[PDB]
Design a protein around this ligand. Sequence first.
Ligand SMILES: C=CC(=O)Nc1cc(Oc2ccccc2OCCn2ccc(=O)[nH]c2=O)c(C)c2cc(C#N)ccc12
Lengths: 547, 401
Amino acid sequence: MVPISPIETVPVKLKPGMDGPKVKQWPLTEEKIKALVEICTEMEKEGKISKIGPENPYNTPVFAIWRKLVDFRELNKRTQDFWEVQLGIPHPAGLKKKKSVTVLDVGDAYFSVPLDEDFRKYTAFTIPSINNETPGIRYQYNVLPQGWKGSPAIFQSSMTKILEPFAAQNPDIVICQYMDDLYVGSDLEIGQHRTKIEELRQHLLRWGLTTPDKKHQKEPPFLWMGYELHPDKWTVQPIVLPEKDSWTVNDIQKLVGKLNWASQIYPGIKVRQLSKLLRGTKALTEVIPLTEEAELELAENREILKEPVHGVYYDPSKDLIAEIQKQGQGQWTYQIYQEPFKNLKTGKYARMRGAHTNDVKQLTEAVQKITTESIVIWGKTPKFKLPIQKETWETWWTEYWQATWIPEWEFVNTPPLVKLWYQLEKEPIVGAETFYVDGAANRETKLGKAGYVTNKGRQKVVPLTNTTNQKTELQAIYLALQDSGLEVNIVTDSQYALGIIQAQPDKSESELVNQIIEQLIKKEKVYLAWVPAHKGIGGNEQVDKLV
Amino acid sequence: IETVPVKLKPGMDGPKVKQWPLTEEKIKALVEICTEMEKEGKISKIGPENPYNTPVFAIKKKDSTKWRKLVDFRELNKRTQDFWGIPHPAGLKKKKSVTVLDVGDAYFSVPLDEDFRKYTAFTIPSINNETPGIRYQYNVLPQGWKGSPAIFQSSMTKILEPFKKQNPDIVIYQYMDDLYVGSDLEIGQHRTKIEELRQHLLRWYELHPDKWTVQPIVLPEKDSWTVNDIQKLVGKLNWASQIYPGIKVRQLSKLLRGTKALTEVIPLTEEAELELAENREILKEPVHGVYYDPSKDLIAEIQKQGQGQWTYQIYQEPFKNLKTGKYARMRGAHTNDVKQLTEAVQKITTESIVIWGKTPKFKLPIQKETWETWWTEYWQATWIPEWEFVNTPPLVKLWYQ
Ligand SMILES: C=CC(=O)Nc1cc(Oc2ccccc2OCCn2ccc(=O)[nH]c2=O)c(C)c2cc(C#N)ccc12
């Protein structure tokens, strides 16, 4: 016998202060008991488990479905935490094309790696006896049990330590590990590649690990985690938008699932309306009628999902590009590619929950998202193509009160272009009328007034019902914008209004703010000045609106 | 060569902080650096039985192309037991000059307590999550951990004993991986003395706090005031009345009676000139009842002023500034707001370390996603402060300009 190299065990403990599991074994039928006795007899003959005496106080239930199924949920609750290395799956767009590629599933994955001996006593389980007239057969696991908390992490670390020297001494190939399957790729000739695959099977055999003696039953295209991996391209598994007479909540969540998943390769997928119909529902069976916006959006989704679209693999020798387009209503779409018309991947970005916004902030956020995703997938920041003029960006970031930055980018003239819709003056305007505005409301009756007095003697006061102080301050500014020329100075004491306008929104939830924005867009020059209230500043007429 | 027992605070587990994504060149730099450290025994690979993690990345300090490994030990620092203390040298800020030295290598010769090593675990990430991350744990005192200067304090005292006994006029302070050396010599004599101290430490950053002062609130001096000038003046004085008691604005607001054009010149009355003069006198004095409390946090606020100019205030209670400043330095960041902000945060944290011996909590005028995306690209210090994000534009910005 050729000596098998031992696999070093991982020392495992339980959570602090806790004890091993002690669960009552379920009564099983005679058939199930016989089946489990046969299975456990074979496993004991193979060495996966071993019989134990009555000293072991711990017990974990067992089932037969024959196949043995041990329910480790309690021991999983009581087992220590491990470093789970499977967080975020490798994206196909990050893979690098290889001439020859092989997939090797390892046989008896968890059952070929030994368990820490001091921990084996917590894996104890009993097989009930026929008519329960004898003590049940007691067993404990000697290897990593399927379903136990620590099996995937310990198996992955052991496999990594075993594969380390082979990968080190074979730099002309690439090896990757995922669950119970290994992916080996190389640009060598098919003969050299199959040879090195044999060398890998031998290296794994030196530790007592079994590889397919037959030809590997997995050949391209590979269907993996909703993906289609082809020798030269990748895509998503087919996305079919069904025809429904009435769409319920689960049908809409299925649709937004297929659309969110399909959006990573299909450019232009919109999910704003279909997900908007799910806002504040919390009912899985509630039927929600489709708005015409959601029907048109679904029609465009069917028009995009008509014929299949594929993505290419990553080539590190070519530059990485990411192009952004505005879609409207806070929707943005982007393509990441290295050659024109050949996308590595695509995606979308929806604006955050806010009361005021503008397009430049949303574009900035989308850029940050694409940057982080690209660093995850490819390890570098792409060069951007953005629908915004260099002059627009310079004016924005130079005049914006917050610090902001976009990585290297260039302008692409693909409408609709992001622009600045208005710009307030830095100094008062000579020759422009000065509107002193104010508004005030009663907290009980919700009655208020908003108006202005100007330096030319122009005046106005308007009474309002069902209003607040903030609403009347905004309304006063709005009246000044309505009744003034193309150039106007506006004096207010509202820290609220100044806080809103100084954030420079081009779209808002409040219709009053949006009306103010529409007025500002029509003006040539606007200087907005602030003064303290109730300080005796003439012109600032708090008494005129408190009547 | 003898490990000192170190534990965590009662009821607190080890740090479990997600490692953020890194570019390829930073990953390679960390692979080479950590390979060398493993050959030196400073770190060792660990298995999956270690669930703890602390983020790691790579920087390039000043005047150097070699990469450096930076570990974000903030969580482990706040979860590590309090070590005890030495009173802060209140004369370090008074000294004419201070030089900062990186004594981080000295920590790597002292072993780390066995049972504690598993809490210093970090992960070198892989691109696209292809291969598992390379997990390490420290065997010696790590740079960036607050326990490293506390443990090495005795050895550092023994090493710096001859130099301290030689020059009683030189102040020496230690914070994390940095040694602050203050004196009153000439720049050349200071540099030769710093070389003397570095070769003194070998066989075993020009700062000038004297050129820094606290900034008063100043008012314009004009011969002709417009309506806008007087309105802004009244706003600034009304804001300053929150800090200074006797500020009075009624005689200046009396000039604004009537609805006049913003650009119209208004002559000041005699009562308004007297009021403005009294306000100047009030503003020339320091703030009433402003003290430092070592039991409270320091808060630093930064405002972007444009044209590469930035303002900041360090306080503990609102309107009770302990320090104010204006950083306008231009150093290869002319076209990048985030790099400027990052250098400003580093300078303010340095001044805070010199003055009080601890780092402040920043309020940054930047969106969270932008800052957290880009700040590690321009970081050059060995410590990291805490920060929050300001999303509403503060009105008082121009009152600090
Ligand atoms: C970390 C991620 C990773 O390695 N993922 C994967 C890699 C892989 O092959 C490679 C193995 C070694 C190096 C690069 C590889 O692919 C480069 C791109 N590529 C992909 C397909 C193909 O035919 N030709 C081609 O060049 C295969 C076959 C995979 C199969 C499954 C299934 N089921 C799931 C994931 C796979």
